Every structure is written in structure tokens, then in C-alpha cells.
Ligand binder design. Structure first.
Ligand SMILES: *CCC(=O)Nc1cc(-c2c(-c3ccc(N4CCN(C)CC4)cc3)[nH]c3nccc(Cl)c23)ccc1C
Length: 282
């Protein structure tokens, strides 16, 4: 169901950001035969070197165009010229990581707990679609409004077949500081490995954008996890919230809570935000 867009249908206004993948522009999309102006993000990728790389781009686009959930960022279309341009709905505030870093003073406990609910709802939706994200992190959650965030970036996602519960990677593409231990040791990725990355993502939100295992090299993360050491308790978290993060980091993947449980646990805490998160001027 991939919608193909022509160059005349959209126009680039200004640059939003960039990366090794390419450049993202703030754009305006006018569908062919219409007059409505839709604000869009235009992700113009670098030229692919290999046909394998070109398929990986298209595979990511098919996945991103197929997800339909209020807390998952969908692909609106694709334009093929000298390069590949991916058109998505504009998220005006950007990634949740930079948002919590640049608004640390103005973020309440209700906002942090609601984000945990929304991210856990989107992941639970992806789990029902038999998708393993494999790259969940605060840098890959986009902020439509401060009350509404969405999961994006399916460049590492994998679809599970009829009777398979795991994905066996052929290499290392995920940042190790978000990887579950079984992924570090056996390249196994499951929904419960996404729960590990979810607990890291929550830790990023509760520390207002700190780097996990800051100053520790990537080659020594496995050594840390083998000794039983985890991410420290953020100063704003009560014992209830922090133990939820610790269960996401248990060695037995089935001992970790599932996303559908995290929805109820964080919805309960969102009803009394100041009971579970103590912020200075909340
Ligand atoms: C944290 C990782 C990151 O920067 N990702 C990213 C996101 C987009 C992007 C944006 C976007 C919106 C707003 C801003 N700014 C607002 C705040 N100012 C202070 C800085 C710039 C920046 C980016 N909106 C999007 N909508 C849909 C899809 C995407 Cl990817 C975005 C762009 C580029 C990057 C790298």
C-alpha cells in the first residue's frame, strides 16, 4: 500500500535536521488534484550504493506505511527521483530526546508518565502486528504536541513469521546501550528485548536526556550487565517507578513485564503523578 508521490505535489520549506541517512526538510504537500496544504516532513536519503541497500530502504517504507496507530508515526508516501524521499506527517516539536533536554524545567510528572503510557501503547500495537522494533529509544520518539508522542524509525524492524517468536540478527547494528543482554550475547531479538529498550527509553525521560552508561565504552557494557549492575535510579523516580525499570532489565526475557502490563501500570501512576515522580516545581 505504498503511495507514490511526484515532485510537483510537495515543496521544501526549510531544513529541520539531518544525519548519516540524509536530510529532513519541513515541507508542504498538496495531493494531486487537490488544494489542501498538508504540513509534512520530507526525509531525503543519500543515494544507495548497493541493491541490497535499496531494498532495505523500500522494506522500511513498506513497514512504516502499514502501521496505523495514534502513537506510531506513519509514512504518507514516497518520491523516487535521483534519490529516495520519504514523506511523513510533520511532528513540529521533534524527537522526545531533545525535547526533554531543552524543556527540563517546564516538564511535569504528568507529562513524563503520559509519554510512558503512549510509548507502551504504540509498542503493544507493534507487538500485535508481530513487529519487533529493535531500535526503541528516546531519539526515535517524535513529539506531535507535548501531550502526544509517536514512535518512528523502522530501519531495523523485523516481522515475525507464523510460528517464530525470535529474530536472529546477522550482525550488530543496534546501539549496545539499548540492547537486551540476549541480543548482545546471542543476537536474539524479541518483543521482550524491545521491553529492555523501553526501560532504557523511560530512564532517558526520567533523567531528562542523560546518556545511559555515560563515559563507559561500548566494549564494556556486557561486562557491566553480567555483574548485575543496571542504570541508576533517577532522582525524580520513586521506588515504584524505578523497580518497573529494573524488571525491564531482567536477564530472563520472560521475567520482564510485557507492554500490555506497562500500559496499566503507567496509566495507574498517571492518575496521581506526584505520588510516583517528585519534581522540584511540579
Ligand atoms: C532527536 C533525533 C532527531 O533530531 N530526529 C529528527 C527529527 C526530525 C523531525 C522533526 C523536527 C521537528 C522540530 C525540530 N526542531 C524544533 C525545535 N528546535 C529547537 C530545533 C528543531 C527538529 C526536527 N519533525 C519531524 N517530523 C516528522 C519526522 C521527523 Cl524525522 C521530524 C527531523 C530530523 C531529525 C534528525
Amino acid at each position: 500500500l505504498l503511495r507514490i508521490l511526484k515532485e510537483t505535489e510537495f515543496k521544501k520549506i526549510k531544513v529541520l535536521g539531518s544525519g548519516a541517512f540524509g536530510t529532513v526538510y519541513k515541507g508542504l504537500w498538496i495531493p494531486e488534484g487537490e488544494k489542501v496544504k498538508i504540513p509534512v516532513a520530507i526525509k531525503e536519503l543519500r543515494e544507495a550504493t548497493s541493491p541490497k541497500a535499496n531494498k532495505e530502504i523500500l522494506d522500511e517504507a513498506y513497514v512504516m506505511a502499514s502501521v496505523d496507530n495514534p502513537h506510531v508515526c506513519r509514512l504518507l508516501g514516497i518520491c523516487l527521483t535521483s534519490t529516495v524521499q520519504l514523506i511523513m506527517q510533520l511532528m513540529p516539536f521533534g524527537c522526545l530526546l531533545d525535547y526533554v533536554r531543552e524543556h527540563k524545567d517546564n516538564i511535569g510528572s504528568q507529562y513524563l508518565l503520559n509519554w510512558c503510557v503512549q510509548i507502551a501503547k504504540g509498542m503493544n500495537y507493534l507487538e500485535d502486528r508481530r513487529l519487533v522494533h529493535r531500535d526503541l529509544a528516546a531519539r526515535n520518539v517524535l513529539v506531535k504536541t507535548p501531550q502526544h508522542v509517536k514512535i518512528t524509525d523502522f530501519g531495523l524492524a523485523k516481522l515475525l513469521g507464523a510460528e517464530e517468536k525470535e529474530y536472529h540478527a546477522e550482525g550488530g547494528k543496534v546501539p549496545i546501550k539499548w540492547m537486551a543482554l540476549e541480543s548482545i550475547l546471542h543476537r536474539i531479538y524479541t518483543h521482550q528485548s524491545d521491553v529492555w529498550s523501553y526501560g532504557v527509553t523511560v530512564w532517558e525521560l526520567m533523567t531528562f536526556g542523560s546518556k545511559p552508561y555515560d563515559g563507559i565504552p561500548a566494549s564494556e557494557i556486557s561486562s557491566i550487565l553480567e555483574k548485575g549492575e543496571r542504570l541508576p535510579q533517577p532522582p525524580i523516580c520513586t521506588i515504584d517507578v524505578y523497580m518497573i525499570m529494573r524488571k525491564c532489565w531482567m536477564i530472563d526475557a520472560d521475567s520482564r513485564p510485557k507492554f500490555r502490563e506497562l500500559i496499566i501500570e503507567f496509566s495507574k501512576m498517571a492518575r496521581d503523578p506526584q505520588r510516583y515522580l517528585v519534581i522540584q516545581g511540579d
